Amino acid sequence: TVKTGIAIGLNKGKKVTSMTPAPKISYKKGAASNRTKFVRSLVREIAGLSPYERRLIDLIRNSGEKRARKVAKKRLGSFTRAKAKVEEMNNIIAASRRH
């Protein structure tokens, strides 16, 4: 940051000599991990795609990433996860039924 030192405007506020604290591990609560990558990958190829996930990749190959999202968005909760879900599908498609 660095604050202007006045009480309006862009970096509004008091100039204090700053510190920057040690990072909290909760804050790394989402993070991957080698153990989880492995098990999720394994489980995936064990248990294989689910109905909506099949309708999803054919929708891609046959209609584009935009019809895919629009539907994935209804199927899942939201637009954002729909994005993530299509991307994942893409990466199934590519990594597999290609190279």
Binding site: L42, V43, E45, I46
Partner: protein
């Protein structure tokens, strides 16, 4: 082959297959138990072996891989089940016998 939460164990062929480990689906959670002095046991494994035995074990591992690992990729495509009971097998075993080829 038992285990009743089958989930406890369904991932295991895949696991071994992945980790290059030779495995076998064996009849007996009970029998597997007795060899370890529990009532039941679920799984049993060797990591270690006295050289007196090493030999006999490579032989076992090969017949075993022959039947399980080697076949794993092919078995991954076959759905099981879908079996009629005998009253209904008999029904279509003789209905389909007469019908087509007079």
């Amino acid at each position: 082959n038992d285990v009743d939460p089958i989930e406890l164990v369904v991932f295991l062929p895949a696991l071994c297959k992945k980790m290059g480990v030779p495995y076998a689906i064996v009849k007996g959670k009970a029998r597997l138990g007795t060899l370890v002095n529990q009532k039941t046991s679920a799984v049993a494994a060797l990591t270690e072996v006295r050289a007196e035995d090493e030999a006999a074990l490579a032989k076992l591992v090969s017949t075993i891989d022959a039947n399980f690992a080697d076949k794993y990729d092919e078995v991954k495509k076959h759905w099981g089940g879908g079996i009629l009971g005998n009253k209904a097998q008999a029904k279509m075993d003789k209905r389909a016998k007469n019908s087509d080829s007079a």
